[PDB]
Amino acid sequence: GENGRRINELTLLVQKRFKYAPGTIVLYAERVQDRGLSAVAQAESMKFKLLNGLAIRRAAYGVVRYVMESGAKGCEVVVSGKLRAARAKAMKFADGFLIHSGQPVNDFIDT
Amino acid sequence: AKVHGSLARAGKVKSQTPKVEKTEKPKKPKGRAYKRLLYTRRFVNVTLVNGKRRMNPGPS
Amino acid sequence: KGIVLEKLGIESKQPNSAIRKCVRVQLIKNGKKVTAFVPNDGCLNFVDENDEVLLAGFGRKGKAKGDIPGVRFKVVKVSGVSLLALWKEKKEKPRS
Amino acid sequence: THPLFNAETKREYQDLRKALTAAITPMNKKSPLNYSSSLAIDLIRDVAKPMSIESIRQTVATLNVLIKDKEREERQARLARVRGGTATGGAGKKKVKGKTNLGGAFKKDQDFDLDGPDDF
Amino acid sequence: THPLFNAETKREYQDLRKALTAAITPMNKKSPLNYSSSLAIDLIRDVAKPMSIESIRQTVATLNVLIKDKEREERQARL
Amino acid sequence: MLMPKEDRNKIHQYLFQEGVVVAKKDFNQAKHEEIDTKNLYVIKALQSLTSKGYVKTQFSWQYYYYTLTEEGVEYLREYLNLPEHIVPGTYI
Amino acid sequence: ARVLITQRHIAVGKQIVNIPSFMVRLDSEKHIDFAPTSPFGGARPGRVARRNAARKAEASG
RNA sequence: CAGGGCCCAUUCGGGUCUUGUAAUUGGAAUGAGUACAAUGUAAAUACCUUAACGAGGAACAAUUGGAGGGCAAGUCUGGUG
Ligand SMILES: [Mg+2]
Ligand SMILES: [Mg+2]
Ligand SMILES: [Mg+2]
Ligand SMILES: [Mg+2]
Ligand SMILES: [Mg+2]
Ligand SMILES: [Mg+2]
Known part of the structure; x- marks a missing residue:
């Protein structure tokens, strides 16, 4: 904001x-x-x-x-929810490859 | 089989429709002039485009 | 042309849930009994009783048309006034 | 004393309706409580009196649309002052919902032949 | 245009309403067809658009009960 | 809500001074901090202020964060009869 | 061109033609010109011009 | 009112050279129609010709079927359920 006006008030809230x-x-x-x-x-x-x-x-x-x-x-x-009907449905949209298991997922996948 | 029925319900929705009055528009030209404006909206002024030309776009 | 005998509530075939609002008519030239389907929304309120209706086929060359079991004809005019003109309120019926 | 309009066709009928609306309306600018009760309620029923079963049902239906639209406009007005979403704002515990722009994708749901090659 | 009538009181409005009921209604007898079209319904919308939300429901309810008795009436007539 | 005039002026003057107010969602706590009035008063009065576009709230683990708006600085000023631009939050 | 043909200001020989599909025969191309009994080929202006001249002569007298 | 290189080599400046929208204004043009007259005709009517009148946005206002597919045309908005 102007001269930090929003971040000034955000400081005031946390104090x-x-x-x-x-x-x-x-x-x-x-x-x-x-x-x-x-x-x-x-x-x-x-x-x-x-x-x-x-x-x-x-x-x-x-x-x-x-x-x-x-x-x-x-x-x-992934989008999951009711699209046009009472019966809900999950869509998956992917590209590339991803790993799923092990310690590598913790270090490289952000979710 | 079931040749009887509930004949009392005939015209239900046609009676339930709210009467919305037509707005009054300027006249469209008739004949060669109408083909002229259709040609102008289709070929020279192709102002509305989505990479594919559509004639009645819903509001995107 | 024919004379309306009664008004029928024939229910449609499966899967379709409706009442189809036809009429029985006795033909004037033959005396034969015939079922005719009154086409549009609310148009059975014109076709009340003992009327001169004009009938046509449905287009299926003598076959029953749709989900409507066993009718082969539709109503075109009632009492000398066409049914779409009555439906679009271009004209209106005589008394009888 | 109503000799002013002896119009006999719909197009000719139109002029009468406009003029009567011009006549009747401004009477609401003054005495509004007097207007609504004494005159609006009973003239409507009296002009509804001629018409048939179907026609009156349309009139009720038309009026309901009026109700719905009016409430919609008023709901714009109340939530003009209140800064965020629903009435009472952040105190409220109830958020303001939005609408899913589906396009035409999911009606009578199926698989989409028209996949999109690129995204803006 | 509208040169005859002014706002004083509920009583005098009943005069105006009654006069209006006299004026409007014969248009149904000459062309009923136009009567169920533009003239009657769209006027009723036009006179109810400057009103109060509760009043228009009061307008609706009177119509609703009016139609109801007619539905009885025709049923009796047919039977 | 029916609270005496003096503590509504306490709540309203404290709000002007800090630009913000934080309030734990504890009814019957009966003693606010930073303010010697009941906790239920400062919640309910700021509920009355948010419902007229003067202050906006955020719940954020039962704490009710209030920061007043541009409407808030003009309304309150009219309310306290203080000199123009006397709001701490507004001026750095 | 369509309205000029239809409103009879055109003459392919010495004869007026008001048919747009006329299919001129390529020695008639030299002779398409305005009709003699018309404005744009001269000797009397026309209805709306004569009216406007009538109004301006009315205002002069 | 919504657009191209360039004269410019004068950064978001006129935009010539155009293309279309306008609760912005102008005159011109003409028949449908009406009508002296003549022609037409056995006599007329009409056509062809022609004085006089006859236009411009509520005027002299084109419909009929459609807009899921077949099969042109809705990523709409209310109503019914
Ligand atoms: Mg799941
Ligand atoms: Mg089947
Ligand atoms: Mg149509
Ligand atoms: Mg349809
Ligand atoms: Mg449709
Ligand atoms: Mg298609």
């Missing part, structure tokens, strides 16, 4: 709740890198697209295309 002394707690903003290689960002971009009113496959093919263009080894998005 009152966590009982910190005024001045001992400070907030910084930071540009995320590698935005396609972020599962929490890509899910939240997907979440806003459906709320803004984008077509559902458009978004889901759009986000999996974006991540693979960003240099990911494999991307995978």
Whole structure:
């Protein structure tokens, strides 16, 4: 905001709740890198697209295309829910390959 | 078989439809002029395009 | 042309749940009894009784048309006024 | 004393309806409680009196659409002041929902022949 | 145009309503066909569009009970 | 809600000064911190303020975070009869 | 061109033609010109021009 | 009011050279129709010709069937259930 006005109020909120002394707690903003290689960002971009009113496959093919263009080894998005009927249904949209088991998943898959 | 039935229900939905009055439009031209405006909307002014030309797009 | 005998509520075949609103008519030239389907929405409220209806086939060359079991004809005019003109309120019926 | 319009066709009928609406309406600008009860309720029933079973049913149906649309407009107005989503905002515990733009993908549900090659 | 009538009281409105009922209704007897078309229904919408939400339900309910007795009436007539 | 005039002015003046207010969702706690009034008062009054577009809330593990808006700085100012631009949150 | 043909301001020989599908015979191409008994070929203006001249002569007198 | 290189080598400046929208305005043009007259005809009517009148947006206002597929044309909005 203007001269940190929102982040000023966000500092003020965290001091009152966590009982910190005024001045001992400070907030910084930071540009995320590698935005396609972020599962929490890509899910939240997907979440806003459906709320803004984008077509559902458009978004889901759009986000999996974006991540693979960003240099990911494999991307995978699942949409589960009632689409047009009372009987719900899960869609899977994938590209690349992904591993599933072992210690490697902890280090390379972000979910 | 069941040749009887509930004949009291005939015209149910046609009576239940809310009467929505037509808006009044400018006249469309008739004849050679109408083919002229169709040609103009299809071939020279192709203002609306999605990479494939559609004639009655729903609001995307 | 024929004379309406009664109004029938023939139910459609499977899977289709409806009542099809036909009439029985006695033909004027033959005296033969015939079932005719009154086509549109609400149009059975024109075809009440002892009327002169005009009938045509449905187009299936003598076969029963749809889910409607066993009718082969449709109503075209009632009392000298066509049924779509009555349905679109272009015209209106005589008293009898 | 109504000699003003002896119109005999629908198109000619149109002028009468407009003029009567011009006549009747402005009477709501003054005395609105007097308008709604004494005159609107009973003139409507009296003009509904001629018409047949079907026609009155359309009139009831038309009126219900009026109700629905009006409530819709009012609901725009109440949630204009309140900054976020539903009434009472963040206190509310109830969020504002959205709509799934399906396109035409899932009606009478099937598999999609038209896959999309590229995404904007 | 509309030169005859002004707003004083509920009583005088009943005069105006009754006069209006006199004026409008013979148009059904000359062409009933136009009567169920543009003239009657769309006026009723037009006079109810500047009103209050509860009042239009009161408008609906009176129509609803009116049609109901007629449904009885024709049933008796047929039987 | 029926709370005396003096503590609504406490809640409203405290809100102006801090630009924010945090409130644990504990009814019957009966003693707010940062404010000597009942916890139920500060929740309910800020529920009345949010329902007129002056303050916005977030629940966030039972804590009710309130930050007042641009509507909030004009309304409250009219309310407290304080000098213009006397809001701490607004001016760095 | 269609409305000029149809409204009789065109003459392929010395004869008016008001048929747009006329299929001219390539020694008649030299002779397509305006009709003599018309405006745009001259000697009397036409209905709306004579009316407007009538109004301006009315205002002059 | 929504658009191309370029004259410019004067950064988001006129945009010539056009293409279409306009609760922006202008005159021109004409028949459908009406009608002296003549022609037409056995006598007429009409056609062909022609004085006089006859236009412009609520006027002199094109329908009939359709918009899942076959088979052109809805990623609509209300109603019924
Ligand atoms: Mg599951
Ligand atoms: Mg079958
Ligand atoms: Mg149509
Ligand atoms: Mg249809
Ligand atoms: Mg349709
Ligand atoms: Mg097709």
